[PDB]
Ligand binder design. Structure first.
Ligand SMILES: *[C@@H]1O[C@H](CO)[C@@H](O[C@@H]2O[C@H](CO)[C@@H](O[C@@H]3O[C@H](CO[C@H]4O[C@H](CO)[C@@H](O)[C@H](O)[C@@H]4O)[C@@H](O)[C@H](O[C@H]4O[C@H](CO)[C@@H](O)[C@H](O)[C@@H]4O)[C@@H]3O)[C@H](O)[C@H]2NC(C)=O)[C@H](O)[C@H]1NC(C)=O
Ligand code: DOK
Ligand code: BOG
Ligand code: BOG
Ligand code: BOG
Ligand code: BOG
Ligand code: PLM
Length: 326
């Protein structure tokens, strides 16, 4: 008797006192004090105020600078759009619901907010996977007669949308489901109940294998091989101080990107490990949503790492912000 069940929700709070209410109807101030809902709102406001400008500016400077519109940069624009889906499908709705203390848009809005927020995060995840694959192909040259062009980059972008849809769409039609989660102000995949009517168990396995294990392996393999190839070529040209300088910065950047990916990935692994190692206590709204809570900031630091640290985008952003000068 850990929470309270109802049609389309699971409030992680016991109803022996009789105070639990539908998260679609009344504020959940027994899960958390009102000031903590306000802090959830303040957190959403921070993500909005940092997330929108950085990601919109990425799309904007690409319009003004011809040299950014190269096929290898298409996946980065896809990343920027995905973060905007998270900013407007998730953060802004959650800022609005948190100030009410519950999900005021009903079960239909729960599927909408759940779908688009899950879609945004999925497109971003697979954009990082596709970018790793593309860089591996260009550098390690595993295909002998291959040249990466416009059609290939479009293929990679469409691939992320397909992978994002095959995660975000099944809960709309009977495999798992979308319900309020955590403090019940935002909606997502039901990892919290074993709803047999929608076969939640098998969807969690499928999420774990395809959308969690595989992205980590691909990112690690591609960047591992890329670093190996680059170190290998630089070893054959140690008389070039710039070759060694480029090798050091490629390695340093791959380390930064892998560590950033692990900072978002490991919390899920730790919490899932705890849920399956102990598996004997009730998990409050906060605990099993802690990985999701901190993974939201990826809408801010991913464009910082993949775009603002790119030498091209940075100078074009400075030129755009400073009205064409400097
Ligand atoms: C967590 O647990 C709490 C406590 O159990 C639940 O809250 C209760 O929910 C029930 C509804 O399931 C509330 O029901 C009350 O009784 C009447 C319902 O209509 C009945 O009317 C008669 C009497 O039985 C019959 O025709 C028929 O059986 C109907 O089922 C209403 O009359 C009540 O309305 C209010 O006004 C009347 C006067 O009209 C007052 O006298 C009543 O006291 C009442 O306040 C009401 O609908 C019950 O009141 C709820 N209790 C509390 C404390 O809120 C939650 O549902 C549960 N949470 C979740 C998420 O499931
Ligand atoms: C993009 C999200 C839609 C998706 C996501 O939210 N989940 C999938 C992974 C998850 C938690 C739910 O599923 C799991 C199933 C079982 C065990 C652990 C699990 O972790 C995601 C989030 C962060 C990363 Cl890095 C990768 C994927
Ligand atoms: C951009 C920010 C918009 C915030 C809108 C917040 C509207 C809050 O609305 C309030 O919600 C309470 C439930 O907690 C109700 O009791 C109040 O009657 C209602 O006015
Ligand atoms: C390196 C990974 C970058 C993308 C991270 C995306 C994080 C998405 O996080 C997910 O968001 C959903 C909607 O809010 C929630 O329902 C899920 O519980 C949460 O894990
Ligand atoms: C998933 C891809 C991660 C690649 C991380 C590669 C980090 C390698 O980093 C390099 O390691 C060498 C020893 O192996 C050291 O001699 C170098 O100084 C160091 O730059
Ligand atoms: C670091 C301080 C605790 C952070 C974890 C707080 C967990 C509250 O749970 C939160 O509920 C919100 C409303 O549904 C969701 O939008 C968040 O994804 C979820 O983490
Ligand atoms: C190039 O940058 C020349 C233009 C001068 C811009 C300087 C002003 C930028 C200030 C950005 C920080 C805004 C802070 C708002 C905090 C709420």
């Amino acid at each position: 008797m850990c929470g309270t069940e109802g049609p389309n929700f699971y409030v992680p709070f016991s109803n022996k006192t009789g105070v639990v209410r539908s998260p679609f109807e009344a504020p959940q101030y027994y899960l958390a004090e009102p000031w903590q809902f306000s802090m959830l709102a303040a957190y959403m406001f921070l993500l909005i105020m940092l997330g929108f400008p950085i990601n919109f500016l990425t799309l904007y400077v690409t319009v003004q600078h011809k040299k950014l519109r190269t096929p290898l940069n298409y996946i980065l624009l896809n990343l920027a759009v995905a973060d905007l889906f998270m900013v407007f499908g998730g953060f802004t709705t959650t800022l609005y619901t948190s100030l009410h203390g519950y999900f005021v848009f009903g079960p239909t809005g729960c599927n909408l907010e759940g779908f688009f927020a899950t879609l945004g995060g999925e497109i971003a995840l697979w954009s990082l996977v596709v970018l790793a694959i593309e860089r591996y192909v260009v550098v390690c040259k595993p295909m002998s007669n291959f040249r990466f062009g416009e059609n290939h980059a479009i293929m990679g972008v469409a691939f992320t949308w397909v992978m994002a849809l095959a995660c975000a769409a099944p809960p709309l039609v009977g495999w798992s489901r979308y319900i309020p989660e955590g403090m019940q102000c935002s909606c997502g995949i039901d990892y919290y109940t074993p709803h047999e009517e929608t076969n939640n168990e098998s969807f969690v396995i499928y999420m774990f294998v395809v959308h969690f294990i595989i992205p980590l392996i691909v990112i690690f393999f591609c960047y591992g091989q890329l670093v190996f190839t680059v170190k290998e070529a630089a070893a054959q040209q140690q008389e070039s101080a710039t070759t060694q300088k480029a090798e050091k910065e490629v390695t340093r950047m791959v380390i930064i990107m892998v560590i950033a990916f692990l900072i978002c990935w490991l919390p899920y692994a730790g919490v899932a490990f705890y849920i399956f190692t102990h598996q004997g206590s009730c998990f409050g709204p906060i605990f099993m949503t802690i990985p999701a809570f901190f993974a939201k900031t990826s809408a801010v630091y991913n464009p910082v790492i993949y775009i603002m640290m790119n030498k091209q985008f940075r100078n074009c952003m400075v030129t755009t912000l400073c009205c064409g000068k400097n």
